[PDB]
């Protein structure tokens, strides 16, 4: 693999591609926060979204956004998709990174919006940040990261178009229905543990906003959890030799 | 662009079209409404369907009305939705204003179905209407109307089908899914600062069928809020410079 | 319009159509009142699927039932629905009654079953029935079904494809996500008034196995309610002048 | 029927398959009952993601492991779905047992997982495993589990394309969205009684791992329910004589 290839040398499409995941993930990281902290301060019981209201917020962003920018970017939001498609040699190491920037840069912004709206609510219930639960130790988390991950990234393949490419690129364009589901799914089973990371710009921007020791003591594991369940999904799909022209047929 | 183009002396599908913005959004209101008012009478704790319900019930009415009225209209339902596409050149300054009067009447006529219906609890739960609400100042609620807008027409404008328009118009034809799914989000985030308006003919409907002094005094946000997000997901799908032949390709 | 045509004399065609929507209305009543009554038999608060999962067990039978019915039957699994095509000319009066017998009778024996799986529950909490409820009086119901009955059967010709046809008939193919949106929809705004009817065979077949006064009081609201709100959307259909070919391109 | 066919000595397309069942099938349990175990031991009332977020997870884990594996192996996840496409000729005997230990095996992994992150409540709250509960009887449980399975299988037959097949064998693709969908559905009507089985991998799995005598005195019934379930919606589908080229029109 090259550093990088002729595709980025296309450069109002590459920068416009870089822009499109940094609103994108500017755009997920204010509209799930902003649910999270609209139910963490409701004061009636059942006066909220409650949890169920949450997950949908995480997988119906990713499906509306994955929908919005898979023919500009690919459209990630997320560096560990970034980072499996990058090892199954689908995005170039430069490209690569350029995304996982946008995407940091996005979600500090996007949570940075949520902290100026609601500020108050915002400190005192948490921020949006992923963290380890009561009750559960960091060998868990770190489990529950990378299985949650992998869930996501073997959707992600199994959603790529072997024949169409975002613009001037051969970057998949991707099914955003099932990746969006993937992504609900995996909060139900993981928001009482981590609040669900599965996506280390989301983790990032939420810690970088919040700003506290135990959230900092945590994020290794939001980002060395996907990386992993990422890389496994990646040799995964490799192994079921599926890359080829498995075209799943959509619903 | 002129005041309007030959589409608008097709007078028999130009009237139809605006008949079918009329009802869709007399309908949108009707329901939507409805469902508010129903959870919010309910004397049961967790006895309703609760605002993850109402969220759905904006978001789903959407995406069935987009469905039933893209080909007939373009399926707006929507003033900040006409206003965005206007910018765009999409739609003329005649057909433009024809739709959001259409609108606008349609939704003061579902919110009049709903208080015919149940006046009583109507009244003393709050007409369905958007105001700031507790414990927010205008700024934030202004805010979260532009970026809560500019994610439903940053949607809309990836949605547009660069091939099909609505009968006798170049009006683009939308996919209803991820409209619908983009609204059904930005409630999540957003009915507990605003109620949610992202759109001035629910907020205009609600307004003047509920009429109280502080839903008017509020108002103002619910018609700049929205045509700014509008105008800024304009201004970037014409910079990601996409509406070329961007055709997302749906789920 | 003839009392049948020739598609009537494809007799095993036309009896496997009748079995189609036979089963399947059972299968609607079976499933959406077990649903019912397994929140209404709850003792916890929050213990069950609450009214949200109500609404859902609804709209998403009608997804299911309409998607594997309609290349069958056409798949209409409610009288109001078959009156609106018969009304439009789409179905033969032969064809609908003997749509209308086949949904009523199997109605009754899914309503039947859930009382022979929890006979005590069953009649304790309302039988599945739909009625008038406290705070309304019958003309705000039979305006909510009349309306709700609407914008089923609106989405239903908006959702009929011009070109497919139900085997051996001409009885249209029917998109079935919308037609279930609209259903789920029509519920979260109804439910607190009637139940939500929109559908005369699954009203019935509640009132015969309930079989309370109560409840056959009220019954002719929802046979009388659902056949206007189908007759209207008819005549609207016919009016936006939209059978033609209007075919709407899904989501 | 032979035991096998020709599609069963491609080897490595045959391992494959199996693995991804195996994989799909342990992925199908980990999320499904690490989202029951996060609900039940929830300490606040409304805290959690409620009985509707557990109807979820089973039901979208279906759409999207169905949608990943419909190409590999044409997504199975479930050996009543198995052993009806197995009556139906679609499956040999060979590819039909293979299928159910991989799915077995997954199961028990990924109930497995949860017990490893969560052992504490894994054992507490039930383990995510079905049994009768109190109040019905055995009969009731098995019809519950019968036309449960039937609803589910029913949805498989009309899912499946007649001209489509995984790769280098003749077994049917399926849609995946209408199938989860069942799944949602069955669960909304079913998780009172049962847990909802309709699926002998996943009640086995959940034995397997919780291991009390309870529950394996109740195991029977998710074998022989979901069994004669499956081979009712065969028999059925055989009848509506609808195999042949019957190709339900997606959404």
């Known amino acids: 693999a090259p550093f990088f290839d002729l595709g980025e040398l296309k450069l109002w499409s590459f920068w416009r591609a870089a822009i499109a995941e940094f609103i994108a993930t ?16 409701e004061t009636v019981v059942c006066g909220s979204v409650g949890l ?12 509306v956004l994955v929908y919005c920018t898979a023919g500009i970017s690919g459209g990630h939001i997320n560096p560990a998709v970034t980072f499996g498609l990058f090892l199954a040699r689908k995005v170039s190491l430069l490209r690569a990174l350029v995304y996982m920037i946008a995407q940091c840069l996005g979600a500090i912004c996007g949570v940075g919006l949520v ?11 948490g921020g949006g940040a992923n963290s380890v639960a009561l009750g559960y130790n960091k060998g868990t988390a770190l489990g529950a990261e990378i299985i949650g991950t992998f869930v996501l990234v073997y959707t992600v ?30 909060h139900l089973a993981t928001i009482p543990i981590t609040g669900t990371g599965i996506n280390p710009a989301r983790s990032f921007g939420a810690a970088v906003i919040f700003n506290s020791n135990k959230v900092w003591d945590d994020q290794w594991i939001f980002w060395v959890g996907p990386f992993i369940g990422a890389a496994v999904a990646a040799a995964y799909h490799q192994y079921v030799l599926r890359a080829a022209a498995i075209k799943a047929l959509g619903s």
């Open 115 to 125: 902290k100026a709206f609601m500020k108050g609510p915002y400190n005192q219930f």
């Open 157 to 186: 393949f199994s959603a790529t178009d072997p024949k169409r490419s975002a613009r001037d690129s051969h970057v998949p364009i991707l099914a955003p229905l099932p990746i969006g589901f993937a992504v609900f799914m995996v």
């Open 52 to 63: 169920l209201g949450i997950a949908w917020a995480f997988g119906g962003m990713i499906f």
């Open 26 to 41: 500017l755009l997920f990281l204010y509209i799930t926060v902003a649910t999270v902290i609209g139910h963490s301060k």
